[PDB]
Design a binder for this molecule. Structure first.
Ligand code: DEX
Ligand code: DEX
Ligand code: BOG
Ligand code: BOG
Ligand code: BOG
Lengths: 255, 21, 253, 21
């Protein structure tokens, strides 16, 4: 019968629940500085994380998991989600040339050359460049990002593990449907699935770097770089166990 | 054992429980 | 692979001025008045950059100095509008007007008291660049052409050289088209469509100018313009509106 | 003949003359 969606599609849902881009409300009328750029980005991160929660609750099945797992998943991948979304906007808005934290706030050549900016942004640019190299479609992107939310669980699973794996497998399939939809030639359907899933696995490695740099800054009043209420609680939250080896990073490929 | 999580982020917990409107 | 020899379009690319930011404070609520004012400030700085750009264009400097001023005066709006459309089409597929990557007119700002009435035409050119999927080289040649899109009805003291240069860039636009397509039939169609876009540019400029002159001559609105724009606008105001100027076209109506 | 509003683009001319560096 009539379509698009008179009988909605799972990926159709993700498309409509995707939160819209927020603007940092940065004052570029006055000179920049590492300290000011980062602070503005942290505040932006707070609001983006807040939106991520509203987004996660709209993902079918997510909020059927124990409420604690819902909290765990977000705390274990808020960086992955934000960094991945960042790379996406960078790839789409400027072919991964620049980092587009917000369409009105771009880390250009001038800002990239600031003191500690490049050592940080470096890992972010990587995900953007990767999305551009593989020409990731919007749909594949929506599925992949959802999978990032379910990319890391505790070393003892969650209180709704059975349901979790079921949701994750559901979106792994969704990713496959996006790959097939994107093309007609099934020749390299599995080859692309390997690349995309490989990229997801690499997110753990980039998150670790971004996170080490997130904690080191958070715990350094000398640096004077503010974090909003939202991020502060999550950083102080994870900071202890994001080192001792409490989290189990799920991977599509072992190697 | 012990669930030491008791405290850490009542803000998120709060945020995840109420969206009708 | 070593060409080690500059082409006319290769030099046109290295002289292309880099995008500049408006240094707009968006940490406080927006308002039609403030945005138009910041964009005007940006316009002056862009036109100033457009001057150094025009001077680097092969053959431009060897035209009478008076004509150099005439061309920049007669096409500053087309050059800026075209550049704007280009960045918008590139940055967001012509959905958002990207005056400068840090100052973009989002949907929220687009609905302000008078934003759309004037932005609709800027969006037009941005839309067309997206529709036609204009390449960088084609874009470069076309923009140069807009600088030579109109002259005073009578001529320039160096009209002779002018038409020669303009011819060279029309052929430059042809070269860009041929090495982007792949075939030969759609090459002429390409040229037809691209030259048609340039022609319509005159009309989009007319609507932008009307608005520009309107807001320029009404301080109850309180919108400010910098030195470069104020100076140029005041000059053009009269001679323009009437229609005592000759707009060069590729396709006659 | 006549053409009121003379000396209207002094700044523009200046910018077109200089240059070298
Ligand atoms: C290197 C890290 C990683 C950074 C984050 C990466 C993910 C992200 C994406 C955004 O779209 C906006 C903000 C954030 C959420 C972020 F950019 C800022 O918070 C600053 C951040 C934590 C960081 O720069 C700092 O810890 C410096 O304070
Ligand atoms: C509608 C007109 C057309 C506008 C201009 C269109 C071309 C342009 C492109 C830019 O990249 C920056 C500024 C300018 C040069 C411009 F956007 C501003 O100057 C404001 C402008 C004159 C206008 O908005 C006004 O008349 C406001 O007074
Ligand atoms: C050889 C190709 C992979 C076979 C996977 C078998 C099914 C499992 C599985 O994989 C996991 C293990 O880390 C998870 O954590 C899941 O959520 C899940 O759906
Ligand atoms: O239900 C299922 O059971 C599982 C639980 O992870 C799998 O690994 C599957 O492949 C699956 O579709
Ligand atoms: C769930 C979609 O199912 C599939 O997943 C793929 C991903 O490309 C494949 O390569 C397939 O052949 C396929 O039918």
């Amino acid at each position: 019968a009539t379509l698009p969606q008179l009988t909605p599609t799972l990926v159709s849902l993700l498309e409509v629940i995707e939160p819209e881009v927020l603007y940092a409300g940065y004052d570029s009328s006055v000179p920049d500085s590492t300290w000011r750029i980062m602070t503005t980005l942290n505040m932006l991160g707070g609001r983006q994380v807040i939106a991520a929660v509203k987004w996660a609750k709209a993902i079918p099945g997510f909020r059927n998991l124990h409420l604690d797992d819902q909290m765990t998943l977000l705390q274990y991948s808020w960086m992955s989600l934000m960094a991945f979304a960042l790379g996406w906007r960078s790839y789409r808005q400027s072919s991964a040339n620049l980092l587009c934290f917000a369409p009105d706030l771009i880390i250009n050549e001038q800002r990239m050359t600031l003191p500690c900016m490049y050592d940080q942004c470096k890992h972010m640019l990587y995900v953007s460049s990767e999305l551009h190299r593989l020409q990731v479609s919007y749909e594949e992107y929506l599925c992949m990002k959802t999978l990032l939310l379910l990319s890391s669980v505790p070393k003892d699973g969650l209180k709704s593990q059975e349901l979790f794996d079921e949701i994750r497998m559901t979106y792994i399939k969704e990713l496959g449907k996006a790959i097939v939809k994107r093309e007609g030639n099934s020749s390299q359907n599995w080859q692309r699935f390997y690349q995309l899933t490989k990229l997801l696995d690499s997110m753990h490695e980039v998150v670790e770097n971004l996170l080490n740099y997130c904690f080191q800054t958070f715990l350094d009043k000398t640096m004077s770089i503010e974090f909003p209420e939202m991020l502060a609680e999550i950083i102080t939250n994870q900071i202890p166990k994001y080192s001792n080896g409490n989290i189990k990073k799920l991977l599509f490929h072992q190697k | 054992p012990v669930s030491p999580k008791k405290k850490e982020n009542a803000l998120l917990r709060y945020l995840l429980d109420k969206d009708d409107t």
